[PDB]
Assembly symmetry: C3
Homo-oligomer: 280 residues x 3
């Protein structure tokens, strides 16, 4: 190998997060008061890392942080039921852990935290977090296995009801790369409907990393994937590999989803910054 | 290895089954007259076993047994079309077979019956079994490969329209285990709608067994899975592994499905029987 | 091995295709003027082959050819946006390429074009091709890896809205084989709804080829698969393996989809041509 790969994990990391009501009426998470986004910021860790998240709810309603895939004790579940949500103006420290795979005492193989995951609110609107998630309380989490290939850049695409990342229909979002960049996509689905994500000009492996380790992986290679509420997946592509520069559409392939909005552009540039067939 | 594993199969097994109308108006299967359940009882066999099911329809309407995945001749298809359904008060012997994987004469690999499957009616209401399935005529079937890890216990969760196992919304069902128990879940979906099954605090492999054989399996590890009508899957988890005791929610992650019902508790206890943050 | 396998690819192939309005009001593709079908004809190539498609639009509206999975430059995307659609009476040469898998300079593994793919219009009705696809502008593409097992025959099944291959409900289509034939199914979904495809009496591997290479592939073996708009998959079965001759139903397992239409027969014959329990 010669590409950047993830190191072995096992550090204790500390992080501040905030839930905020935004001027537009949405609700979002951020690492800093006043810099909440929808989607929320990317959290990336190595298998074995522990994360202590000092979470503050600056809203006038109860809110939580619930994560998928990672190890948390019931005190960090982030639900009303376990009293692990947070009162208005409150602060709580959530802890997320991750583990490497390995042999159990009984000889079986324990899986490993690595994968494409996400966090979201589990209490706003309803005690399953319907209002919070609808308003924008969700974000991606990546957990890397030692040896995993690292990308040049990560972009997050979220199908939340009939929006991409809670934006008005036909407003992208658009992402840019240069031919040959190693680009990582985290795809999260929220809300009420099933979707199909499609990319023109590229393809990936339907497995944990979205890439093939080598010629023995029998995983389907696809350009199209059905996702439902709270699914998360990811993959890496080489931008323009075998196909060259261009404004490569990605869309919710459900044909009315694409007709009313839910289309974005993966703008893949030559070194000079131009894109054949696309007028800036 | 040190955990219980499935032995080699090849026994001929005999079983009585009944379709019954229940006092509540539902229809269910059972091994004994008067002990029908919804879901129907678990059938578990080893690859290579043959099963002769002496099926009796005690209802006033035609009924059948149709199974997925296992080997049956067209005479055991369980449909009106092949005249393999059963008249009211009638009896029919269905035969299901299973085979081990192996090399064909041409050098190719023949798959193997092993997996998480299910049986259901294929004729009540309509000749596709819409009324029967809606009323409760469905149940799980497990076929084990020699060497497969055996669980401490198996629980069946069925998303049938907007019910879990045909129960009234918000009535679970709830399942119990102790920290460290090897728990098996069979998840079957029936009816009209697509669903996402989600478990808090646990994860499994999106492959045949729901577990990783070791570090070369590239299967996605998930905590969330889209299922549609007549899908079946299963997996095993170590209860509370890396996360400890607690009332761990499972729910149809479609956010209106969770709001009106379709939530249950995986109650994971310490040895003393207590569950932190949960009041009995 | 002893069964026919795909050779190494790398030929340049030339093909004429037409989009035509049909007498019934549908729109279809064909290799010859007057022989358009719905679905469109099968294109099959070997990894490394290049295809130059001389496409002519004989309709009174703009049309295109867009393919999934294969390598194309943005000039063959087949969309209004890149001006790669085709005016009424126009002709355009689309080029599709395919590549073998292999090691990149950086040591990573590049996937490979092989798989079950499809082509469709991307501009009729809307600039996402809603009218074209609805009317019948879609067809299957197969790309084979060197060494892939070759079938005796390939059949294409398309769930397009609430039709199979744009046929009136309950009109099949029906497919025939003899016990022991190696049959290939290409399953494509189009339109607005999610579906489940189910086959009685047979099963396949949820991976690239739909078959297991041997005993180390941990892929789920299934008889049921959720598909959404623009999904494509395929697999091979041995007709009647372990189950014998019969009229083996396949259907959209969504129970109202099966009630109103969306059921077909895989007619598996003994050498004498008879099918037990089926009256011609
Ligand atoms: Co939840
Ligand atoms: Co969740
Ligand atoms: Co059926
Ligand atoms: Co069925
Ligand atoms: Co498209
Ligand atoms: Co497409």
């Amino acid at each position: 190998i010669t590409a950047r790969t993830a190191p072995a994990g096992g550090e204790v990391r500390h992080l501040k997060m905030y839930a905020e009501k935004l001027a537009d009426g949405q609700m979002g998470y951020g690492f800093e008061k006043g810099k909440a986004s929808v989607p929320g910021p990317l959290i990336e860790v190595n298998e074995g890392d522990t994360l202590h998240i000092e979470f503050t709810n600056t809203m006038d309603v109860r809110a939580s942080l619930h994560v998928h895939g990672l190890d948390y004790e019931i005190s960090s579940d982030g639900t009303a039921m376990n009293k692990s949500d947070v009162e208005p103006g409150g602060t709580r420290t959530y802890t997320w852990r991750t583990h490497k795979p390995g042999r159990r005492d009984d000889g079986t193989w324990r899986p490993g935290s690595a994968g494409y995951w996400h966090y979201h609110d589990h209490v706003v609107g309803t005690e399953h977090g319907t209002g919070g998630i609808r308003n924008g309380l969700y974000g991606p989490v990546i957990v890397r296995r030692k040896g995993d290939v690292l990308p040049d850049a990560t972009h997050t695409i979220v199908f939340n009801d009939m929006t991409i990342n809670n934006r008005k229909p036909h407003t992208g979002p658009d992402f840019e790369a240069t031919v040959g960049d190693r680009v990582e996509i985290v795809m999260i689905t929220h809300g009420e409907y099933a979707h199909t994500f499609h990319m023109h000009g590229h393809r990936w492996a339907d497995n944990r990393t979205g890439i093939l380790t080598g010629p023995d992986d029998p995983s389907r290679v696809i350009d199209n994937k059905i996702t439902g509420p709270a699914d998360s997946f990811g993959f890496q592509i080489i931008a323009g590999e075998g196909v060259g520069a261009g404004a490569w559409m990605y869309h919710c392939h459900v044909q009315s989803h694409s007709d009313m909005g839910m289309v974005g552009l993966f703008l893949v540039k030559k070194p000079d910054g131009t894109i054949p067939g696309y007028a800036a």
